[PDB]
């Protein structure tokens, strides 16, 4: 929630020296190295700021160093101005950010000939100040940044950034070719379960991405047959996650949009701009063509393939969850994992019962697709503030959803979540604990 | 939710100086006006309190101000008062912005009146202290509010404070009976498309049977309710019903349908409606002596017209009668309930970028309604044209229109919302700004 990390999202880290688009070597987080074609002095001007005129490639460690001397410099420089200091006070926490990450990108100076959008956003004219921005020459050469960056001196809001999902795809990225980082299949999965605490591109990775796709398993195990053989850009990774939670249907519109053409195929030319997912839908040279049952098929797959991933965690290995093992899922799963109320709940008001088999669970995980159809059929319980019982709720979700919940999982449902001790649960008991995360 | 979020709920932002009930002149959310007899007294007193010549009138952040002043106020009062803070300290997180509303209400003084109530909350005896408020002074005073007040320090939720919906059907109700409130299809229907405009009667048995004599001179299809008027009688669970009718997806009705079907033989009947005296919806469904079963078909049409009719009567209230909504009419409905500082902005938009092109015709602004009740898969579509990095032109919002309804949408409407809300200018459409204007405007009851 800072400009340091809206900048990595705006800045991308570059280890070797490049030149920009205004054509200067830059380096690190958009570092400016000198504004001479000359390569002999963007390695000194480096080094009495390093330690050493270069390496070739600097590290990440010291691009931070940068990183971190530039952002200050940028608000030192601001601080200093007397036409942008003023604008600079009356901001909020947030559109300050916005107006260092102008500075940080195109200097003090250019910053301040921004005179009338400056005067705007002093007297928070928003709108205005947004509409003049957007005319200008920086708007032209970086409109994707100075979308971002003229949406935050709109809404005074972070909306346009999503820092935090950017955040786990790098925690767990485990390869590099050239800035771009990239998830193997097995990163990808330890990335939708775990917190925490789970190298460069080569020719050997790029070859075993092709053979673990002829070795893997071609339905729930695809993923993990593949482990470290594989490769998900963050726009492969952001667009699984988009869609792992949605019912069938939100599939068909994700298969719709990409099918440009209109001939009920993607092309790989349609597909995000080889990976695992671009060599699994288009084959190895990029011919194949990917028709909605086999997308829905593959979606369906890594949606099972995480159930029992996640079941086998919890459950330890064992080949049955105990009822606390769902009920400690089940605070993760709806993110009450550090509310003191909860854990008490199981381990004090949970019966020793039957074990919770795959089956069990894996049908709770479809209900859970289906939340917004379960929720509006139970709009009526929800509007008269009517807490539901457990045999209505096993009945709405069949109705709702298809789903057949064991009275032992709603059992353990109703044990955790009914707060009150009437046996029911409101509203927000339960609904209002999901999305409301 | 939070005690901010709470007060909010509870005390209306009053801009300008308003008088309440109980004779107090108030400002902001809640703040009175305590050394002010008349209204001069109170611009005097505000005039201190903002340090600004206000003339009676205040801005959104003076009121915030004030605002985290009075909450700041009400801990402190709690926190220094021996009856109080022992009561506060024992309590969770939800009880204790519930004390801190009283107290903010009331003043700790007032509070720490409540001795018996303070003790059992202390106690852990919360059915015990609900009764135990629910008689008081306070509670008659302030009904609804109270009532909340008292669910949270029952429950410790906040369900008292979602989904409300109550006090807006007793705004509009015209009838009562035996102390329960009734609408007529009237009420219901001004109730939907008005943010307001009731001199409440009383009904007799005899009165019942005639308001619910003619049923059959009705029309069967969309003019039902503004056929039937005032000559009905809508319950308030039937009220919520049909507030859930009005937003419901067609992919939703049969499963609405077998929600009801509680013994799964494919009709509803009378009693398991009663799951949910003669009312209309009542006699329509299920005869006169409640001896019809409902059907599926009947029960998807009935569902049909009612959107149908509320189409149709918003399209005449915002056309003003004319067959054809102008786009500026089109904007005036879509733009109903905004709010004043971002609503200044959309019409500062209509005004300088709409053209009059072609006006637009009941059939399309219907096919806009049905668009609304596609908004999830809408919401897919504009992420998809972010992961690309494709700006949402036009052009993408046509084809996002289309893969979300499976229609293309008429260009004059299209146009419409596109110049809306093309915030920055920049020929992109600022789509969660519009996302959020709509479901606000189609979302019944609030
Ligand atoms: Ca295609
Ligand atoms: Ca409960
Ligand atoms: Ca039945």
Redesign the interface.
């Known amino acids: 929630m800072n400009i340091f990390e809206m900048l990595r999202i705006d800045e991308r880290l570059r280890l070797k020296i490049y030149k920009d688009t205004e054509g200067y070597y830059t380096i690190g987080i958009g570092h400016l190295l000198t504004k001479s074609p000359s390569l002999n002095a963007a390695k000194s001007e480096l080094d009495k700021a390093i330690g050493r005129n270069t390496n070739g490639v600097i590290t990440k460690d010291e691009a931070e160093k940068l990183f971190n001397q530039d952002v200050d410099a940028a608000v030192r420089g601001i601080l200093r101005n007397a036409k942008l200091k003023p604008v600079y006070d009356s901001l909020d926490a947030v559109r300050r950010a916005a107006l260092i990450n102008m500075v940080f990108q195109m200097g003090e100076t250019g910053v301040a000939g921004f005179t009338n959008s400056l005067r705007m956003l002093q007297q928070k004219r928003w709108?205005e100040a947004?509409?003049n921005?957007?005319?200008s020459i920086w708007?032209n050469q970086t409109?994707?940044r100075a979308?971002r960056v003229?949406?935050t001196f709109?809404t005074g809001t972070w909306?346009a950034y999503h820092m935090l999902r950017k955040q786990r795809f790098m925690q767990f990225s485990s390869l590099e070719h050239e800035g771009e980082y990239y998830m193997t299949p097995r990163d990808f999965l330890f990335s939708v379960m775990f917190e925490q605490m789970e190298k460069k591109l080569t020719k050997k990775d790029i070859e075993d991405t092709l053979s673990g796709i002829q070795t893997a398993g071609c339905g729930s195990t695809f993923f993990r047959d593949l482990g470290d053989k594989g490769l998900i850009s963050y726009?492969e990774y952001?667009?699984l996650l988009?869609i792992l939670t949605?019912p069938h249907?939100?599939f068909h519109?994700?298969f719709?949009?990409?099918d440009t053409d209109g001939n009920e195929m993607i092309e790989k030319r349609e597909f995000?701009?080889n990976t695992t997912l671009q060599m699994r839908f288009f084959g190895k040279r990029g011919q194949r063509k990917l028709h909605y049952k086999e997308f829905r098929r593959f979606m369906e797959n890594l949606q099972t393939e995480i159930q029992e991933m996640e079941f086998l965690q919890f459950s330890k290995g064992l080949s049955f969850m105990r009822k606390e093992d769902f009920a400690e899922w089940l605070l993760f799963f709806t993110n009450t994992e550090n509310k003191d109320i909860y854990w008490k709940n199981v381990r004090e008001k949970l019966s020793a019962g039957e074990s919770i088999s795959l089956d069990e669970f894996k049908s709770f995980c479809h209900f859970t697709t289906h939340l917004?159809?379960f929720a509006?059929?139970m709009?009526?319980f929800?509007?008269?503030?009517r807490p539901v019982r457990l045999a209505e709720f096993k009945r709405?979700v069949k109705?709702?959803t298809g789903q057949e919940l064991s009275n032992n999982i709603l059992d353990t449902v109703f044990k955790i979540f009914d707060?009150?001790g009437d046996e029911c649960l409101?509203?927000?008991?339960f609904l209002?604990v999901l999305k409301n995360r």
């Open positions: 709108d947004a509409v921005l957007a005319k708007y409109p994707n979308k003229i949406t709109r909306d726009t952001l667009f988009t949605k249907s939100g519109v994700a719709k949009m990409l995000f701009k917004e159809d509006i059929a709009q009526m929800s509007l008269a503030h709405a109705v709702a707060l009150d409101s509203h927000e008991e209002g």
